[PDB]
Amino acid sequence: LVSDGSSRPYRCKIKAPGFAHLAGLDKMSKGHMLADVVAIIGTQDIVFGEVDR
Amino acid sequence: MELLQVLKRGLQQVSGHGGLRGYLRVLFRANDVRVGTLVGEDKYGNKYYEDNKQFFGRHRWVIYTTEMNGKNTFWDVDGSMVPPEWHRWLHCMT
Amino acid sequence: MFMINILMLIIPILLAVAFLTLVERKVLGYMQLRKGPNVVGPYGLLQPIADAIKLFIKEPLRPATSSASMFILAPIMALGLALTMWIPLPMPYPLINMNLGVLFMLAMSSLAVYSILWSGWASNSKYALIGALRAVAQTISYEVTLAIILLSVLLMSGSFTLSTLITTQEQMWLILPAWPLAMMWFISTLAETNRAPFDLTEGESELVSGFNVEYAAGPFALFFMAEYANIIMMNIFTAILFLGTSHNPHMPELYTINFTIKSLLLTMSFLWIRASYPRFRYDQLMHLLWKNFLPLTLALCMWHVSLPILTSGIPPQT
Amino acid sequence: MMLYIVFILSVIFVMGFVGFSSKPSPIYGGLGLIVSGGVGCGIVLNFGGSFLGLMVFLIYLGGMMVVFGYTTAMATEQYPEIWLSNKAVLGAFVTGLLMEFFMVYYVLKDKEVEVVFEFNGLGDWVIYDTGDSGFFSEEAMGIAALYSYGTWLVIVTGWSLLIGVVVIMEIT
Amino acid sequence: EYVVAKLDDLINWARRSSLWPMTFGLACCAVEMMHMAAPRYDMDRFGVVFRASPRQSDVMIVAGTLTNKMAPALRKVYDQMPEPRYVVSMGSCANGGGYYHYSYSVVRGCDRIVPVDIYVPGCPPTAEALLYGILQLQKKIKREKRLRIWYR
Amino acid sequence: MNLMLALLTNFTLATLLVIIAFWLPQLNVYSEKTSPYECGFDPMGSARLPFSMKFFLVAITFLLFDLEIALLLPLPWASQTANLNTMLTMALFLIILLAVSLAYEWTQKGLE
Amino acid sequence: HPAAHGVLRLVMELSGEMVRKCDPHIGLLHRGTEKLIEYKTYLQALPYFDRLDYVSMMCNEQAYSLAVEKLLNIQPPPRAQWIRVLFGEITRLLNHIMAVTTHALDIGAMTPFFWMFEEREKMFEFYERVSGARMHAAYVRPGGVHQDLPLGLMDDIYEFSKNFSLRIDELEEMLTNNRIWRNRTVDIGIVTAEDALNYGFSGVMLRGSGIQWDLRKTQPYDVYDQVEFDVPIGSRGDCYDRYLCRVEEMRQSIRIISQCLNKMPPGEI
Amino acid sequence: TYKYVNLREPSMDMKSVTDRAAQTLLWTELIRGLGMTLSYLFREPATINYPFEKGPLSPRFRGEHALRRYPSGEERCIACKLCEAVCPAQAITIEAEPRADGSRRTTRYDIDMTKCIYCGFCQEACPVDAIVEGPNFEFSTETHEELLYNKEKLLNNGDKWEAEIAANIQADYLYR
Ligand code: SF4
Ligand code: SF4
Ligand code: SF4
């Protein structure tokens, strides 16, 4: 949170997972089937609108 | 052993509730057929039974009857009908 | 009036397969803690007359990209081999008496999967294309688990007909003696007819919706009424091939009464599962058949062969 | 339901073939078989042989063909077609169909024409049975189970299959 | 003469009494849809069975926020549905867009993309004014298919 | 003579019921636009179906285990004989000729 | 259907069976946020932090309201914080009731959903009684909690907590050692590397993978220091040892909610 | 501190390994739970039978709007233009203009009911204590031409129940 010294802010930059836990799908899953990749995601707990990051 | 035990509440839930007439009629409105203990006064046609304080959240219930205000008869029941008092009662806000 | 004994069968059954769909979600309702279709009935028992009528009013699209000649002969089946298979099935008196007829089921158990391969191919691309291909592949590998473990017991009863199979289970409920097999007679029909724990054919999880995806309300009642015309039959079979009733040459009627109070318990098993278990990820799905289910089924066959011969037991038939 | 219910099957059978004996875009090839196989297992179920008929459904028509149909998605043709639509397929058809018809027309359309087609009478199934009999499982192929006398017939077939897989474990 | 208008106490009572709603999860509003099919307020078994495939549905439901890149997807899905179709938006973001209504990458309103029928108003509508919004749509079939064939 | 009366009865309800469902509203006066919007949720999909092998073998692999369990079928009729030893000694061969044919291939199923 | 209450489109080039490639397209929900929070004041722009995720509510804003009190050199009064542990550590009972279930609705089961959300309701009251609304509730602020809580809730928190460790014992006999599930997950998607750090992952898919670190006890928040808890850890880096944190991490919380009802001192808010 | 999970080794002795070979091959586990922990159906269902019974709430609940008035009515709103200026979503719209006597009041007051994000920022900025989020979820009409409200929709909607509202604040106002 930058702030410029007065009332309204300046960049407010939010980071939540979903730039990591899903940066690492492509890596993680190579070499297992397709019917795994549905059950890989569920463990990171990816929930979107958060990737509004 | 359990065939006549619980059964003695239901046969008194039927034969002592409206006989055959006042039973099938309160079942056809919904399957809520359990007869609460007490009653309530208000207001037009719509009672409030209230259970014995033996449940939480299904302990406080209501009954709709007929043609409140320029209304279709019965099988239309929505739930915006309750008088703007019971929102302080039926909703368990207080 | 032999033609009015038939049409008294086809009609009165289409009510069960209809009113199963209701007891579908009541029984599976109270597993969840809730009530089942309620508002419309009054009890709900009136739901399925309203549901049969919404589909055939609702417009039946065809894909612009389809081959219409196959998009008919295929479903014009999913309702035959489901309603033909019922024919020689004693309760107690079957409509037909087929000499070797037990074998005749496998004839009609084998010829339905050749109505899946048509439809999913008849239409179009990869959700019903390779998606109706690889439900072929599992459906034929659960026969070899089957015909053997059907053929086992038939060493223990003497022939291929069904009038003998009431005689031998007299006072012995044929489930004692082979109880190891009986298990595998169950997981088969549940794996073959595409039901809960091995669910893949009809899609929910692994894909969008398997094999049903294209048919709009118009044809899709048939399949949704076909797929439930197998499930209440294999399960109206198992209980003539295992849990036997006691024929009565006098009050035939008390045979069926006690007979539907079994086959109708038994069925309520594919509903009592579906609330419970998850799915198999198609590798594990066949990969558990050859390795695991099969070696036994051969081994037991080397056993029920000798057990009669080694006890002077040999059952009285040709 | 006359006495001709056999002759009416075969001439559907004989017409079962010529569908796929020309050139139909072989996803309809199957539908030239399972009719032919079906009516074929139809004819055999007369004459008293039964078990041996009801197997063709199980071992071949039911079981085999599906493999013939489980491929032709691997060899998959490009954009299939309704046969007899074309001018390439349709031309070859009829002349077959008429060739038995024009045969079947005056084969016997009259007293006799002439000799080679005249020594086959019709209509009572003159031969189709003999007398009466007793019963063994039926009489005929009711006893098709010989693990008695037949042995050197099995043990070749028993052994010839076991090699069926080894060959095919390789080239695959 | 009168048989028609008595017939529409069947067909106009059939289509209203069995609905096969699609849903769109997108944004916050999806969770207060789930709790309509959780056992408290029990959506199904009050006549409406929950999600099916795109082809078999009747009433699609829009939750959530509709950005640019989702519009080309919706429009297409709304089509394929059979005839007797409706569109019931919900949430303060299918009505003119919650907030984000001034953003750059949010379509403003989701009426603009399709002919929407019933509305519901607020971040999450309280899982109640949902069902209250349907017992509008089961009462919004008073219509008659008589008096098109049978007048003009 | 009453079997075929019990078959063509069955289809003719089914081959009826296609038209009274598929066809009847199919000529109804609703819109039914010809737009190429159909073939759901894989919009275009232009390819041949490629050969994928472990799809294939599970065809062949069965077809052969299938045969002999037609050969194996007439045991329960053959349990009634004169000399029976030529049965038990012989009957048990087919099975082990089946089970062997597993064990070999069992080194490689691949992903089946 | 497998969107997990969201809308992603991923594209894979699989090799005949195995995937070996994936490259998802996110950006379906963007909505244009951080361009719109330069245009709003500090207390006016709070909710757009609550509406970010759908599940954790008071745990967001605990991370904004702590990034403002700093620049102001100001701390809440003592009864402030000991709320923000009771709600702050009650919503860890939400995302761990969801990510064991609405994950395992993909695996296909039914009941472990229709069995739980009977209960995840009994919690949503406690957002409604305390302040207003069903889910998103704007309560925490730059100054500590908004307004005091009614006379009550401490016989509805206690009464509810001592019932709860049973429910979490109906997601155990129904899952852990049930085989068809054990086999759907073991040794699946294993990242054990020091890439599982190099990418800068956060908590679980860390702490369940070995490398041992957490930001609750290595840094204080708001009095978090004065209560005792143990951070479950995993054996091998697969999934089924990232599940097993999220059970033994719902059985730690009921320690703190039980430890934090005894200490709340009277004071302003 | 720490803990270590899934760190264990099998015992490897023939008193044990039967106990793990009486498990794989006899299914002695996997019938333990879902032979049982499933049934365990014999508990009373939990359902709020909806059209009639309804569930709990609290006096601080949020929902449909109102504008009160004192005893004999003043339209309690003074149009001080605040509940407008703290509004995150910017739903509110207010236009004052001096009423005939010279006391000021409103003319147009419009809460859009789609944009309103249900803060509880417009209940808490009004110093004269007019505008109040009601506790009734009555909603869901069939046309978006509607939910936009005018002034003279609100007042009624806030004089339809004031027996609901006027008895909540006097539970809640002692805290804040
Ligand atoms: S408020 Fe806007 S974002 Fe939050 S749920 Fe309702 S619509 Fe989705
Ligand atoms: S209520 Fe308070 S804020 Fe809303 S207008 Fe009247 S005075 Fe201004
Ligand atoms: S209710 Fe919430 S949104 Fe609507 S005005 Fe008051 S504060 Fe702004």
From Swiss-Prot, chain C:
Its main localization is mitochondrion
Positions of post-translational N-formylmethionine modification: 1
Which InterPro entries does the record associate with it?
Answer: NADH_UbQ_OxRdtase_su1/FPO, NADH_UbQ_OxRdtase_su1_CS
TM spans (from-to): 2-22, 70-90, 100-120, 146-166, 172-192, 222-242, 253-273, 294-314
Gene Ontology molecular function, alphabetical: NADH dehydrogenase (ubiquinone) activity
| Quaternary assembly | Core subunit of respiratory chain NADH dehydrogenase (Complex I) which is composed of 45 different subunits.
The family classification in the record reads: Belongs to the complex I subunit 1 family.
What's the name of the protein? NADH-ubiquinone oxidoreductase chain 1
Q: Which organism is it from?
A: Bos taurus (Bovine)
Record gene name = MT-ND1
Swiss-Prot record, chain D:
Membrane-spanning intervals of the chain = 1-21, 25-45, 47-67, 88-108, 149-169
- Alphabetical list of Pfam families matching this protein: Oxidored_q3 (PF00499)
**Recorded catalytic activity of this chain's protein:** a ubiquinone + NADH + 5 H(+)(in) = a ubiquinol + NAD(+) + 4 H(+)(out)
Q: Name one GO biological process term.
A: mitochondrial respiratory chain complex I assembly
What's its membrane topology? Answer: Multi-pass membrane protein
Would the keyword Coiled coil turn up in this protein's UniProt record?
Answer: no
For molecular function, the Gene Ontology terms on record are: NADH dehydrogenase (ubiquinone) activity
InterPro entries cross-referenced by the UniProt entry: ComplexI_Subunit6 (IPR050269), NADH_UbQ/plastoQ_OxRdtase_su6 (IPR001457), Nuo/plastoQ_OxRdtase_6_NuoJ (IPR042106)
EC number assigned by the record = 7.1.1.2
Write out the annotated subcellular location.
Mitochondrion inner membrane
Q: Name one GO cellular component term.
A: mitochondrion
What sort of enzyme, by top EC class, is this? translocase
- Keywords of this protein's UniProt record, alphabetized? Electron transport, Membrane, Mitochondrion, Mitochondrion inner membrane, NAD, Respiratory chain, Translocase, Transmembrane, Transmembrane helix, Transport, Ubiquinone
The keyword Cytoplasm appears for this protein: no
Instruction: Describe the subunit structure.
Output: Core subunit of respiratory chain NADH dehydrogenase (Complex I) which is composed of 45 different subunits.
Q: Which family does it belong to?
A: Belongs to the complex I subunit 6 family.
Please describe what this protein does.
Answer: Core subunit of the mitochondrial membrane respiratory chain NADH dehydrogenase (Complex I) which catalyzes electron transfer from NADH through the respiratory chain, using ubiquinone as an electron acceptor. Essential for the catalytic activity and assembly of complex I.
What this protein is called in its record is NADH-ubiquinone oxidoreductase chain 6
What broad taxonomic lineage does this protein's source fall under?
Eukaryota, Metazoa, Chordata, Craniata, Vertebrata
Curated annotation (Swiss-Prot), chain E:
Broad class of enzyme this protein falls into: translocase
Q: Which GO terms describe its cellular component?
A: mitochondrial inner membrane; respiratory chain complex I
Family note: Belongs to the complex I 20 kDa subunit family.
**Residue spans crossing the bilayer:** none
> What cofactor does its activity depend on?
[4Fe-4S] cluster
Protein modification: Hydroxylated ar Arg-51 by NDUFAF5 early in the pathway of assembly of complex I, before the formation of the juncture between peripheral and membrane arms.
Whether Chloroplast counts among this entry's keywords is no
Subcellular locations according to the entry: Mitochondrion inner membrane
Q: Which UniProt keywords apply?
A: 4Fe-4S, Electron transport, Hydroxylation, Iron, Iron-sulfur, Membrane, Metal-binding, Mitochondrion, Mitochondrion inner membrane, NAD, Oxidoreductase, Respiratory chain, Transit peptide, Translocase, Transport, Ubiquinone
Q: Which domain of life is it from?
A: Eukaryota
Chief subcellular site? mitochondrion
Note the subunit structure: Core subunit of respiratory chain NADH dehydrogenase (Complex I) which is composed of 45 different subunits. This is a component of the iron-sulfur (IP) fragment of the enzyme.
Residue numbers of Hydroxyarginine PTMs: 51
Gene that encodes the chain? NDUFS7
Catalytic reactions on record = a ubiquinone + NADH + 5 H(+)(in) = a ubiquinol + NAD(+) + 4 H(+)(out)
For this protein's source organism, the top of the classification is: Eukaryota, Metazoa, Chordata, Craniata, Vertebrata
Q: What does this protein do?
A: Core subunit of the mitochondrial membrane respiratory chain NADH dehydrogenase (Complex I) which catalyzes electron transfer from NADH through the respiratory chain, using ubiquinone as an electron acceptor. Essential for the catalytic activity of complex I.
State where [4Fe-4S] cluster binds.
28-29, 93, 123
Name recorded for this polypeptide: NADH dehydrogenase [ubiquinone] iron-sulfur protein 7, mitochondrial
UniProtKB/Swiss-Prot annotation, chain G:
Give the record's membrane topology.
Peripheral membrane protein
| Similarity field | Belongs to the complex I 49 kDa subunit family.
Positions of [4Fe-4S] cluster binding: 239, 245, 260
The PTM entry states: Dimethylation at Arg-31 by NDUFAF7 takes place after NDUFS2 assembles into the complex I, leading to stabilize the early intermediate complex.
Relay the cofactor remark from the entry.
Binds 1 [4Fe-4S] cluster.
Organism of this sequence: Bos taurus (Bovine)
Q: How does it assemble?
A: Core subunit of respiratory chain NADH dehydrogenase (Complex I) which is composed of 45 different subunits. Component of the iron-sulfur (IP) fragment of the enzyme. Interacts with NDUFAF3. Interacts with NDUFAF7. Interacts with CERS2.
Function, please? Core subunit of the mitochondrial membrane respiratory chain NADH dehydrogenase (Complex I) which catalyzes electron transfer from NADH through the respiratory chain, using ubiquinone as an electron acceptor. Essential for the catalytic activity and assembly of complex I. Redox-sensitive, critical component of the oxygen-sensing pathway in the pulmonary vasculature which plays a key role in acute pulmonary oxygen-sensing and hypoxic pulmonary vasoconstriction. Plays an important role in carotid body sensing of hypoxia.
Which reactions appear under catalytic activity for this entry? a ubiquinone + NADH + 5 H(+)(in) = a ubiquinol + NAD(+) + 4 H(+)(out)
Tell me the residues on which Symmetric dimethylarginine occurs. 31
GO CC entries: mitochondrial inner membrane; mitochondrion; respiratory chain complex I
Where in the sequence is the signal peptide annotated?
A: none
Q: Which domain of life is it from?
A: Eukaryota
Tell me which EC number(s) this protein carries: 7.1.1.2
